[PDB]
Design a binder for this molecule. Sequence first.
Ligand code: SF4
Lengths: 303, 51, 49
Amino acid sequence: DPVEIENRIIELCHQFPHGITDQVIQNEMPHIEAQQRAVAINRLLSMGQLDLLRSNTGLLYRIKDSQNAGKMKGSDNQEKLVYQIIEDAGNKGIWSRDIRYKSNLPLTEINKILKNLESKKLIKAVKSVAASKKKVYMLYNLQPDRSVTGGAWYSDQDFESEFVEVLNQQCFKFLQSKAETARESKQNPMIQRNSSFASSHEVWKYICELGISKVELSMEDIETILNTLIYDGKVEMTIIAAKEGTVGSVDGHMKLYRAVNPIIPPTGLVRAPCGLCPVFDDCHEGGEISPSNCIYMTEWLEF
Amino acid sequence: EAANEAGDSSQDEAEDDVKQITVRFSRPESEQARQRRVQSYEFLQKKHAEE
Amino acid sequence: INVEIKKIMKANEKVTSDADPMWYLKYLNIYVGLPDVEESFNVTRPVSP
Ligand code: SF4
């Protein structure tokens, strides 16, 4: 009786929620040949009560998620036929529009399904900080990915410019003080350069000791802040070879940051009003915009 | 050709190509698209092969 | 006006929307009637060419 075989396979899948191999089924039921077990598995897959997984150990057969229920009003079929791609999205989330498009259902049905799933604590809706258009839906147990939502800089879908400004100012002050101490040490140029260098872990621990904000700042956060400072033309980073130490971030490589003065002072072009003029293209000898009746140079000479 | 592509290296490392669960939604098909699928040649050939 | 219009109406007798199923609009029979004028307030009247 193949029905008994299917029932036994379903019971075995109930016993092992993580899935069962063909070896487990053969050990539990040795008197049945492999062909009958294969036909039973094919029927179970055809009727939609089993799912196949391909692991490094082979093939696994897992019972389809039906016990985990959040929307039992109506049909469990649509509940699982939404929770499926809900879980498939998982940490990255998925907007309600994309859920509707993948489910090929009207807006009312999917709204009811999402509400009922939120009622029984199966899905959580979080606001997409990348593009504040709709609320993405994720699994309640899964931790929200920092890229799609949250982040040390974003606070309630609002970028904190003051926070990053304070971070940049404090890091630059620390690096400038370290470089000043290295210069005043004047023990040896190599030693001076090594002391002016500051590791990412060191400045990260310094910022943690400062405690400007309540949110915990990881090492890579301070690394990105220092990279933005590098992009400002104020500090310099060098990658040295170090197998292991107090940082242990990059394999065999450590980033050292030092405050460095600019190459050259502001050029002579910016000291003239013509170099900073926004309507410089419309300049002409005889016309409405002329150097003779210029307001910029007038205010500049008056000042 | 697939075997030759796999044989680009003499020893192939055990690929971590675990089949992520790509169970697609059994979307409710529009009646026009369902009629198109029924009138498709592949559906007729499968129905003939069923016998 | 006597045969072809009925065939056209039969070809498009049922119209329905994808959203909110089980809803439909079904045409049964179409008539053209006699020529009239809409001059009178909500009342028709025979009018000569
Ligand atoms: S408006 Fe005067 S200062 Fe500005 S670009 Fe023209 S000439 Fe130069």
